Amino acid sequence: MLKPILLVEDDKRDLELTLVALERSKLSNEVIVVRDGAQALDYLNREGDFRAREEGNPAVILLDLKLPKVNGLEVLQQVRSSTQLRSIPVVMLTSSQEESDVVKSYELGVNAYVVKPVEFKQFVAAIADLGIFWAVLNEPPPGSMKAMRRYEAKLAAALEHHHHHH
Amino acid sequence: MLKPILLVEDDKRDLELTLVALERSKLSNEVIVVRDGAQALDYLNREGDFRAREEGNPAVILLDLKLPKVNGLEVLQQVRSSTQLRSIPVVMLTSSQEESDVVKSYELGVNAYVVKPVEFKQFVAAIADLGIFWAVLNEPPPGSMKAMRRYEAKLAAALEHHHHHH
Numbered sequence: 254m255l256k257p258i259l260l261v262e263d264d265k266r267d268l269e270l271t272l273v274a275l276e277r278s279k280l281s282n283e284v285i286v287v288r289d290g291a292q293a294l295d296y297l298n299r300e301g302d303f304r305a306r307e308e309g310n311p312a313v314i315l316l317d318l319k320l321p322k323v324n325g326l327e328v329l330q331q332v333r334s335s336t337q338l339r340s341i342p343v344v345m346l347t348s349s350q351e352e353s354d355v356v357k358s359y360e361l362g363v364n365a366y367v368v369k370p371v372e373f374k375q376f377v378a379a380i381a382d383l384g385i386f387w388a389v390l391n392e393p394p395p396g397s398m399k400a401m402r403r404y405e406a407k408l409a410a411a412l413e414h415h416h417h418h419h
Numbered sequence: 420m421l422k423p424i425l426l427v428e429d430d431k432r433d434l435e436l437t438l439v440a441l442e443r444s445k446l447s448n449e450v451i452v453v454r455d456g457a458q459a460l461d462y463l464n465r466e467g468d469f470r471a472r473e474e475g476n477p478a479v480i481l482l483d484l485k486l487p488k489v490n491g492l493e494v495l496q497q498v499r500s501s502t503q504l505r506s507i508p509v510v511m512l513t514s515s516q517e518e519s520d521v522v523k524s525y526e527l528g529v530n531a532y533v534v535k536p537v538e539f540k541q542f543v544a545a546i547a548d549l550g551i552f553w554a555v556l557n558e559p560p561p562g563s564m565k566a567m568r569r570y571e572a573k574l575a576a577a578l579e580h581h582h583h584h585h
């Protein structure tokens with residue numbers, strides 16, 4: 254029932270901050286992390302590594318502009334040009350308020366902005382800015398928890414350090 | 420999957436403000452309204468008008484202290500004394516900050532407070548104060564929408580006026 258959140262972010266230090274903000278916020282849609290724009294487009298179009306996934310758009314895309322191989326703006330344009338994808342809400346993760354302002358000038362109907370580094374308060378404020386629907390839960394869905402934990406571990410192994418213990 | 424929110428509130432003018440804040444916030448758990456503490460306890464215990472309802476606790480109780488017949492504090496004590504009910508998060512709707520402070524002194528583990536009149540911003544801040552889990556949705560669940568619309572209509576017919584049109 255709950256659709257995933259697609260987090261598109263290469264820089265592993267930034268990924269850490271964004272996932273921690275997500276964990277802290279208790280936002281419970283399953284996170285799916287891809288690390289460049291080619292992988293994001295594969296996820297969204299169900300190709301590549303994602304060829305076998307269930308049909309359906311993510312609830313939200315958290316889209317870093319800084320992506321190797323295929324830039325974040327190319328992902329955003331292909332999303333908004335697609336009749337299938339164009340309805341997906343997007344939070345752009347930018348480097349400065351000036352960058353957010355420039356992106357607004359492209360008129361790609363970006364729904365919200367977070368200026369990096371991502372912190373919990375600004376992050377939740379961006380999600381609130383989307384003006385989409387939401388619901389409270391007593392229990393997180395177990396697949397969501399498993400996914401966050403799995404990424405925390407992969408990211409820890411890759412960065413060769415951890416910040417907390419569960 | 421999503422559990423309802425139980426709104427316990429007699430005064431019809433206050434009910435209007437609380438439902439509008441809920442509608443505006445796009446919080447999408449189904450609302451269930453009861454108008455005094457006797458009805459609230461019947462809902463929670465599946466008795467009375469609610470004898471046939473599905474098993475399960477509401478996600479949140481929005482509990483007005485001012486209730487005819489059975490007071491809101493008696494509902495809160497019976498909830499916290501019950502091994503079945505005591506885990507339910509409660510937002511108390513109070514008349515002043517002094518009232519919130521007094522209620523905190525009872526040590527009934529009240530999770531959040533809204534000082535009436537309820538407005539959208541303070542309302543969402545109270546829900547955030549609960550520190551519970553939540554999820555975003557593109558579509559509200561249709562049963563939720565039907566329920567809000569149904570109450571708006573009953574409340575309009577009872578107050579003999581409306582404030583907006585859908």
Ligand SMILES: C[As](C)(=O)[O-]
Pocket residue numbers: 418
């Ligand atoms: C040494 As330890 C608390 O990271 O298992």
Ligand SMILES: C[As](C)(=O)[O-]
Pocket residue numbers: 584
């Ligand atoms: C007169 As009318 C806009 O309440 O149907």
Ligand SMILES: [Mg+2]
Pocket residue numbers: 262263264317318319320321
């Ligand atoms: Mg980047």
Ligand SMILES: [Mg+2]
Pocket residue numbers: 428429430483484485486487
């Ligand atoms: Mg009252």
Ligand SMILES: [Zn+2]
Pocket residue numbers: 415417418
């Ligand atoms: Zn350690």
Ligand SMILES: [Zn+2]
Pocket residue numbers: 269412414415416
């Ligand atoms: Zn680190």
Ligand SMILES: [Zn+2]
Pocket residue numbers: 276405417419
């Ligand atoms: Zn963690």
Ligand SMILES: [Zn+2]
Pocket residue numbers: 581583584
């Ligand atoms: Zn009218």
Ligand SMILES: [Zn+2]
Pocket residue numbers: 435578580581582
């Ligand atoms: Zn009115």
Ligand SMILES: [Zn+2]
Pocket residue numbers: 442571583585
């Ligand atoms: Zn309405």
